[PDB]
Amino acid sequence: PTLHTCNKTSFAKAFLPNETYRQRLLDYIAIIHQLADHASHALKFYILSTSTSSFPVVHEDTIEAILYLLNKGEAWHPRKEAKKAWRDCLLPYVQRYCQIVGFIHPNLRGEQQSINYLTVSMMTNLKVNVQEHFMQMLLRYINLRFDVKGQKQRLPPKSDARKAFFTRLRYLKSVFLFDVVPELEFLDDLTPLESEVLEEIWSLDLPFLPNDPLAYAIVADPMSFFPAYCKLSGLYEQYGFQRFSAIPLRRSLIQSHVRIDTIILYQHILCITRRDAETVEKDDLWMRVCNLCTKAFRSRCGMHFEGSITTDGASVSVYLKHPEADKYNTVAAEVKALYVENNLPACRAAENVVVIDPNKRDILYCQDSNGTTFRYTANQRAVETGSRRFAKRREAMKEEAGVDLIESRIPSHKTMNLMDFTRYLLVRRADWDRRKEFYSHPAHTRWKWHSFINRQKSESDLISNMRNKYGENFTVVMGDWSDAGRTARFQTSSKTKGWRTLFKRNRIDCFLLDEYKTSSVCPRCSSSEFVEKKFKTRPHSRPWRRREGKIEKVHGLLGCTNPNCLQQAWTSGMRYWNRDMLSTCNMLLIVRSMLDGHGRPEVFSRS
DNA sequence: CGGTACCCGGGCATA
DNA sequence: CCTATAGATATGCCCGGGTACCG
RNA sequence: UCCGAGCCGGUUGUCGCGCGGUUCAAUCCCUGGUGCGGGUGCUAGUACCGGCUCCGCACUAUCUAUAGGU
Ligand SMILES: [Zn+2]
């Protein structure tokens, strides 16, 4: 549901100036971060080591058992039969992993809450990693085996050869992905490069539903695909393809956010017996360590603190929880539920309408009916957010600390071979002490929190400037990055949710409009037969491409050659235009046509 | 010295 | 540095450590 | 892996213009903003006329982890 919110504040303003409590909390979060990292590494090691017999069906019990083992040793005494069996199976592998890494059991007490939270988080990471990326990686492997990389340089752009190649590509995938039932003659209709693909795909033991497609089966029981997914990465390793993280790893040594609640408070922070804690109200028990009067803890939209924070030693994210909280395909409509054509009744009553074109450099280029232009570029975000300022010093310190030569030697972590994974673990352990000392510096977390502060300030200033230029109330109509080869969820509508969310937070209505044929029409003559693009050339701006002698045609510059737009005095012979200006003018024309009821003009249509 | 039963705090199960 | 998913705690019961009393 | 923004021109609604001119923005410390009252101070003219800075009331801002993309 949508019954929760978060407010992030600084560590100093969160906890009262009690040095003992702060030190206890810092030690606890460091221990929890170490436990989580070692648990992820041990889970991957166990999964790799058991491939010789069978890929285990990892369960929440598995993660909980791994965490409890790393924490205690053989002292864990679960009473549940499933947990007991998982403990018995995992103990040798965890022992070997600890011996290889030299990990010493922290013997932390009261591990129930933290272990449960980390188990839930890791299982969620497995579920999400298996849900979507499984199909995408399978399709990527199928494309790579067919050598589409080379075929793109072998087939004419539109000739019948490319059509036949596309037909074959879908024909093979339908049988491989269980989309269409094959006939017997399909057996002999396979070249060696295709027979190998069929055999490899079938060797993954893809689970499926007899009455539903593979994609629906993935959504229904995504975790059942976790074993096959682990197999898939192995193939990527055999053929040298772009490897993917089959089993997620918490590589970073920078102190990560750790969950703290009332139970953890009275177990490790306040250090009081449960019988004493149970006799005091939750809020009264929290005030002893946290300044509830701070702005971050105030209620919003009927939500209350409810004793949940996540802290990493530099910033604290306080979660506000609604009383109706959970207490621990049709969706395609959302693709077009927000588009302008379905929201015209609301657009007609908007005080002002602003059309925005996104670009990889001009992240926003906004124009209104009055012609007042505005833009928010990637340079402004990079400078104000401090991303480059932090990057040029945090990465530079590696020269002073010499850790750059350490991280580079680390082999790729996505390997699936047990020997290679052991090599990676040993190499990471070799210089683990120096990296741990380096990342313990407050500067890393301080920059991570200052980045959030700067991004929030930049986002607020952007809205302030937009309101100042266009007015207090306005409706945003933005393009969807349409092109001649973008027709899927992965490419068009997924690259705009950030700005839609940003506008929603400020209660600014945002709608999407088709960007197709936006750069075709000249508004001054409403004609596309006399529009020229990419005529002039200049040296490349990027420092490495520029020194290679590469010359690039201007992308954002367009021209109109129709005589009606040309003054006889102009020696250029063409009226110049900016790509963003023309796109905004065309979007304004389309919106005006839609509002009047005439609909999208035929010239901008996909006919 | 040798052998019992209770109160407490910690640990684990569960939705 | 961008985008996407799931989940975003609390109560009850078992047990094992130490302390109390008789022969 | 290198990059600020506003404005006037070369310019005609023109560029990642390594084109010219001019204004502030930034370096460090800071969770941001909105509407309401005072409370030291700093600014231009005889309480007004404001702007920067704090105090206090409610209105609001979804983060963790991983993964993918570069
Ligand atoms: Zn024209």
Author numbering: 18 to 345, 355 to 633
Report text from the authors:
Fzs and the prokaryotic CRISPR-Cas12 systems evolved from distinct variants of TnpB, a widespread prokaryotic Obligate Mobile Element-guided Activity (OMEGA) system 1–7. To explore this diversity at the structural and functional level, we resolved the cryo-EM structures of three Fz1 proteins from different species spanning two kingdoms of eukaryotes: Guillardia theta (GtFz1) (algae), Spizellomyces punctatus (SpuFz1) (fungus), and Parasitella parasitica (PpFz1) (mycoparasite). The overall structures of the three Fz1 proteins show notable similarities, all featuring a bilobed architecture and accommodating the ωRNA and target DNA in comparable ways, consistent with TnpB structures 8,9.
To gain a more complete picture of the step-wise conformational changes of SpuFz1 cleavage, we examined the cryo-EM particles for variants with altered conformations. In the ds2 sample (TS partially modified), a small fraction (2.8% of particles with well-defined structural features from the SpuFz1-ds2 sample) exhibited only an 8-bp heteroduplex. This helix interacts with another α helix (α1) of the RuvC domain. To gain additional detail into the formation of this small cleft, we overlaid states I and V and examined the changes in the ωRNA.
